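so i finally got all the pieces together for this one. its seven components total, 1127 residues if u count the protein bits. some of the lines might not be protein, just check the labels. i wanna see the whole assembly predicted at once instead of chain by chain like last time, that was a mess tbh
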Amino acid sequence: RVVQPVIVEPIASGQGRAIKAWTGYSVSKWTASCAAAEAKVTSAITISLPNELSSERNKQLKVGRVLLWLGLLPSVSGTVKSCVTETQTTAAASFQVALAVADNSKDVVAAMYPEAFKGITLEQLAADLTIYLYSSAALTEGDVIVHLEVEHVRPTFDDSFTPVY
Amino acid sequence: RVVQPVIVEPIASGQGRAIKAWTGYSVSKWTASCAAAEAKVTSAITISLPNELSSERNKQLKVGRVLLWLGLLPSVSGTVKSCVTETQTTAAASFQVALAVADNSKDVVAAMYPEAFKGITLEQLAADLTIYLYSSAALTEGDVIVHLEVEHVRPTFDDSFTPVY
Amino acid sequence: RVVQPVIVEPIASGQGRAIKAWTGYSVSKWTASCAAAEAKVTSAITISLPNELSSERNKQLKVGRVLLWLGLLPSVSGTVKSCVTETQTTAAASFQVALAVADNSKDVVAAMYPEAFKGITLEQLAADLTIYLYSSAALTEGDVIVHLEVEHVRPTFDDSFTPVY
Amino acid sequence: QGRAIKAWTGYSVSKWTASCAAAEAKVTSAITISLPNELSSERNKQLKVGRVLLWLGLLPSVSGTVKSCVTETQTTAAASFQVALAVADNSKDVVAAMYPEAFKGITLEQLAADLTIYLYSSAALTEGDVIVHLEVEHVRPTFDDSFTPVY
Amino acid sequence: QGRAIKAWTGYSVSKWTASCAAAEAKVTSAITISLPNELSSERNKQLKVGRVLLWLGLLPSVSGTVKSCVTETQTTAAASFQVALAVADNSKDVVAAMYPEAFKGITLEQLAADLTIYLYSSAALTEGDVIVHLEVEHVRPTFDDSFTPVY
Amino acid sequence: RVVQPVIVEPIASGQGRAIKAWTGYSVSKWTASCAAAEAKVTSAITISLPNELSSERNKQLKVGRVLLWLGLLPSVSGTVKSCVTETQTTAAASFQVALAVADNSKDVVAAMYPEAFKGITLEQLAADLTIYLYSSAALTEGDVIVHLEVEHVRPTFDDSFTPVY
Amino acid sequence: RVVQPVIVEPIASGQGRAIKAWTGYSVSKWTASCAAAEAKVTSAITISLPNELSSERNKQLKVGRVLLWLGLLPSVSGTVKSCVTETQTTAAASFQVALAVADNSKDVVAAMYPEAFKGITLEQLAADLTIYLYSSAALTEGDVIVHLEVEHVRPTFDDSFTPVY
């Protein structure tokens, strides 16, 4: 064909398109503060369901896609990587089988899991999966905040009040 | 007319009809554990927004109806009353102006506020209103759990993931 | 408008209307004999699936509504209350979070749980929930029989014999 | 092939067990047929029976010949095997006894009242060495498609 | 005739093995059910189970009675044979155990977590004397009809 | 399908496309001069409404989207990052929860907040949020000018003069 | 013609599009753990069919496309390259004839072979081809996990149980 002249419009941080939750689903977003760790050590961070999702009913809600990203202190300088995989017997090995990895040495430091955990229950998510965090430099407790956004079926138990009697 | 013979079907605890949230609204339900208190003393319990509703955006969500009920230890025997009103300079006075009062010496021990606080923001709810608890007998910390169910506009900030960039 | 004269036909014990199970569901009913307990003590009674429902396959059946009622010896006189909640670290605390309570000091000594456990598995019901029983007076082993009626998906595993090859 | 016999429409199969009692070599013991709680209500005791299946679950180490059957209660336990319409024998390829016609039509109440299970072993038996499995097909309990009236 | 049971449409059969551990005469050993790598992803662990088949592959010279079964994990290994819904016995014409209904519907994850394989031999066993074969029918892995995203 | 040949027309600084305000809204743009700060220290800069928007009436205008960008002296060389978040108890922690960050080590040194503060009041924006500025190198007063562009409902209070009676 | 303005939406790790297998085909994915090796040495890794595909019948399935990617420990730092070629008499020579190479110094550390092995048998793939792994730095056993994804004709042998007579 004939060459199509295009012009790439620049976008600022925060302007990326947001991914909408599927119909009937909602995205629960929570965090975890990293524990201290020595240089080049891969730490395992347990996935714990936030209180509102711990009820007997709620922890049965189906999962959709999962997003993981890192929030670092502005002074953090090493290489920081993180991922979500099934619990490993060797933490560092998680990066060898992870389908996506959040790496700070990239233009976009997030890891998306569109299929990997789709369908499991919130309870299973917390029980079967683990978050792994690696830093080339030593980490002080709190140097990194792990952000986990889990899309799941919207609970309906709170679409009405408790019966008065 | 002609007398209509009817028969009143008995219902068990938990069978009362549940009140559905208005369209676009959802009901957030949280609790508070009573503090120790001497006999016949009316204690003031602060209304604090649960974490997920504390974000700058969320605390701006409009309120609908509010429901208040008490959860008592099975051994509690005095008269226990509670209500939600604008913060008073004299705690006990709240019961003199409250529009509804949860009283354990009643068949239904709940207090519903269909109009009283409709329209205020969640932030205002926590800032302007206070929960008051009275017991004819002395109370040990935790003898009573206050249940507050606040209907409010359903937040939409979590209907999608955070933009990756 | 026009006043409608009405006659309230009285009904005897046993004449209450029965609640039909949702289609595709059936109701399993079993009991548990209370353990001896001192006055005002609230005891925890384990929920154990009857043999017919213990199999690997049947314990996967989804739960619908749950009904709880008490069978007391004619001589039992104190105040007897009971409920079903997620297992508590403190037995007495169950009554503070229960959404329904079977109280013998009422015309209907039963408690219904229409939404609380809807959707969990029969195995989860037995693993995550507990029945709590309180009496103002001391109880001797067997003074109270707890009746648990669990609505769940109709078991298909029992629509055939064990294969004879 | 490896298929299970499906219950007739309107019927379902209740399966329960009984743990054998200790017994001396070559003795034939009588085991009572007791309806499980789920079928003990006066209403459920009236459900009509269809086909009945009896099989044995033995400890792997249990040796010797073990036989069992279901028949009308006998005056002499051992005589049951002479009139039984099927016998579960652990020395055969299929250690089960199927009764497709024998008790068809009686009520669960009659099944428990008129029939008895008999167990024989050429070797002495220790309590629990054999678990007797009884699967009774009967019409679905209508009474159990609803909750008990709260009042 | 000599035909294989075909998997239900939408389902496929995964077949894997386990080598028995050494064991003394008449001892019942417990063998863990571990999903093969091909089915270990969190997604594949959720595939629903259909029918299950268990059979034994023994050295030709292995003598004595060898029995095996699949049941919910037991407190007492030997007790498994008393409740097993099928037993693979090398002293029978067909040394296999088919479970067409027992575990239908659970996920592969539950199969590996809730069930256990039990193996008994009247004679002592040397590590590897018996190869246990487990064939599990489950829904086809959707996740495996495409490559992993390169990015 | 068919490969489409394309030519990427290069664009100069200033040629980026401007984002139009939602109808009924307008964009107020003001700045703040950074305070002197030591290397790697992240400083908090207060958000103060310009006089035109301080009035009792104008400070009630609802906020839409917020844009933040940096104006550095040509000689500034370190790594300079900035963000807008709810006021932190620890300044540096802001970057761990910010949804966008203006980084001078990028082609676009700006940060956009499309949903984070949407709906709050202009007064709340100034009261509840803070601007955080970090530099790998020491900063002397004024080395960086913070540009804050706040989209808000068009002010109607300024559509008339103060009444002259 | 007319210049078309465009915005390049950034994507996170894991958001890449998956390649669907040809109809009638399926993709088998297995791995191999690298052996210890000295710096700059290129090692040969045998391709072994997983058990499910070793049977006389399944090893006859025709191969389609082949994908190769690497899973490295987060701490691995050298240059790591890998490829799939017909077995070489000299390991290092493989990279000189490979049509694709997985290089960790690239944005996509994977190599695709769309035509090279199309049509050969699964058994031939294991017998005639080898995976080669090179690292600029010394490798210790397990530092790298090689992921091989082989598209082949859907196995029909596994659509039935072993006959039970």
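Chain E has one domain: 1-151.
Strands of chain E lie at 11-19, 28-32, 49-58, 66-72, 88-89, 96-99, 115-121, 130-139.
anyway lmk what u think
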